[PDB]
């Protein structure tokens, strides 16, 4: 037995936490990313990068702590602890936002490790690897949003911060500056996510309400056995119900479950494509025909133009605080605003 | 427009019921993807490599079309044994309950922000 | 040289449900993207 | 409205071509 086979045997032992070869990448990187996030949200400020308190130590709460993006001055520097910025100084590395690339890169490699784990375990137990394929969607989201978007922009500063309110800020930023809601790729993402939730709810309810009477208890949960060969709910009854209620119904179980995979995954992939577009400011910001008409016709008003006005307001009022490195000085009189407000 | 004004006036993003709605829909999509992928992954071989695997299932067939035990083995090794459902009925109840509860909470969030009890 | 029948050729199929699903997908994609095509 | 002069052709083809692809495949099915 060669040493490689012996190692392979040890890594793939049946234990409470499977390790595998993929574990060598997953567990250290995932632990680094998680511990980095926890450390930053507990102890680390964003005073020098954003002028914000972002840790429990500073008095922030769960909703307002974040591992904030690094200072815009560094561009897309990877900000290694040993890099030319921190130069091995851990305190300075924390202060310049070095924890953000730490978490982002370790999380990217952890995600790779987790999907490799899906592949490895699928191969070991002898099933098709569709779980890894489904997980490609979250990977596309993470790559586009946390890497490609800031890479197309001026710096990592404009990446989403790892935090609840940081993410909320990123969301509102994308609305105001990119008109992200108007983006058809985002609308396909929304369709996929809401459709996935709908499919989850409707399938769970349909199964639970077409169950066969296989026990005597009012508690129907123990009238199932994992090794039983027969279906536990009536597909025929479900199909008739949905055909008469909704007009159409699934008749193929396999197609049903592939659809439940397909819808949210495609939603994630389409939204990731849209985010890639936004990385280069290739926005679906305006409808030029309506802009031109409004510019020449002061009685043409649509919900689109109203939303454009909202975006202008958000940008002007938010930019000085959101982008402190720019030293934006917008005097009170240049701020757009409606009457009396 | 409705959503943007709503956020401006109620801070719905910082409302825990809307956070529960987001958990509802994100998690519902997550569980839809997992359930579909685990069932598709554990399909019993009934077709050839040419035809769609969907033809391996016949409408109204009594037998099970996938191996739930193999799906449980895979998932309980992906995370750990006791986090994996092996009872299809409990699994499907969870699939129904998660998005429904999340959406109930977010509906109540909007309904209570209707009375200007706003987000944090 | 001789022209010999290729034994790797296979029929393609699209069942009626697949047709309805594809037609709906195409129609809704058109609905979605037409506004942006017109701009 | 001053819309893109390629909008009609783009939208019509965007719908039409996949439509005839599906129609061809469906109609020939079972041959």
């Amino acid at each position: 037995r060669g040493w490689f086979d012996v190692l392979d045997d040890w890594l793939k032992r049946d234990r409470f936490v499977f390790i595998g070869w993929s574990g060598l990448l997953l567990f250290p990187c995932a632990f680094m990313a998680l511990g980095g996030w926890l450390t930053g949200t507990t102890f680390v400020t964003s005073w020098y990068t954003h002028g914000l308190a972002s840790s429990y130590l500073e008095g922030a709460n769960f909703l307002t702590v974040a591992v904030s993006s690094p200072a815009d001055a560094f561009g897309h520097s990877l900000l290694f602890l040993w890099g030319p910025e921190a130069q091995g100084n851990l305190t300075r590395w924390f202060q310049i936002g070095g924890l953000w690339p730490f978490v982002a890169l370790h999380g990217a490699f952890g995600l790779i490790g987790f999907m490799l784990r899906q592949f490895e375990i699928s191969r070991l137990v002898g099933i098709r690897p569709y779980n890894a394929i489904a997980f490609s969607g979250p990977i596309a989201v993470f790559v586009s949003v946390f890497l490609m978007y800031p890479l197309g922009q001026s710096s990592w500063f404009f990446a989403p911060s790892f935090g609840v309110a940081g993410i909320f800020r990123f969301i509102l930023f994308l609305q105001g500056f990119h008109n992200w809601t108007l983006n058809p790729f985002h609308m396909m993402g929304v369709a996929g996510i809401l459709g996935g939730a709908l499919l989850c709810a409707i399938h769970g309810a349909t199964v639970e309400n077409t169950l066969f009477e296989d026990g005597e208890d009012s508690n129907t949960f123990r009238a199932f056995e994992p090794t039983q060969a027969e279906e536990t709910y009536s597909m025929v009854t479900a199909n008739r119900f949905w055909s008469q209620i909704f007009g159409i119904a699934f008749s193929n179980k396999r197609w049903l479950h592939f659809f439940m995979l397909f819808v949210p995954v495609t939603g994630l992939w389409m939204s990731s494509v849209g985010i890639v577009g936004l990385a280069l400011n290739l926005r679906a910001y305006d409808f030029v025909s309506q802009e031109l008409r409004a510019a020449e016709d002061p009685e043409f008003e649509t919900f689109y133009t109203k939303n454009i006005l909202l975006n202008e307001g958000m940008r002007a009022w938010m930019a000085p605080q959101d982008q402190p490195h720019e030293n934006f000085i917008f005097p009170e009189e240049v701020l757009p605003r409606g009457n009396a407000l | 427009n409705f959503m943007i004004v709503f956020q401006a006036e109620h801070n719905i993003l910082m409302h825990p019921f809307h956070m529960l709605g987001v958990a509802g829909v994100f998690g519902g999509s997550l569980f839809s993807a997992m359930h579909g992928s685990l069932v598709t992954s554990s399909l019993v071989r009934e077709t050839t490599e040419v035809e769609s695997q969907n033809y391996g299932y016949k409408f109204g067939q009594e037998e099970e079309t996938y191996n739930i035990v193999a799906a449980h083995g895979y998932f309980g090794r992906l995370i750990f044994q006791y986090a994996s459902f092996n009872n299809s009925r409990s699994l499907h109840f969870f699939l129904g309950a998660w998005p429904v509860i999340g959406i109930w909470f977010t509906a109540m969030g909007v309904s209570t922000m209707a009375f200007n009890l706003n987000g944090f | 040289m001789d022209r010999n029948s290729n034994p790797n050729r296979q029929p393609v199929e699209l069942n009626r449900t697949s047709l309805y699903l594809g037609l709906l997908l195409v129609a809704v994609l058109g609905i979605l993207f037409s506004s942006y095509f017109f701009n | 409205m001053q819309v893109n002069n390629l909008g009609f052709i783009a939208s019509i083809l965007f719908v039409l071509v996949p439509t005839v692809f599906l129609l061809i495949l469906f109609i020939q099915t079972g041959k």
Binding site: - | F59 | Y20, G30, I31, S34, S35, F38 | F8
Partner: peptide, 30 residues
């Protein structure tokens, strides 16, 4: 005249719905 295009695509989707309901492939138990 882009109104015509919008109406056209919407009508296409609706017609697909009616045919998918009325002229669906019947589920058959066999």
């Amino acid at each position: 005249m882009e109104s015509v295009a919008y109406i056209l695509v919407l009508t296409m989707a609706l017609a697909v719905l009616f045919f998918a309901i009325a002229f669906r492939e019947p589920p058959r138990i066999e």
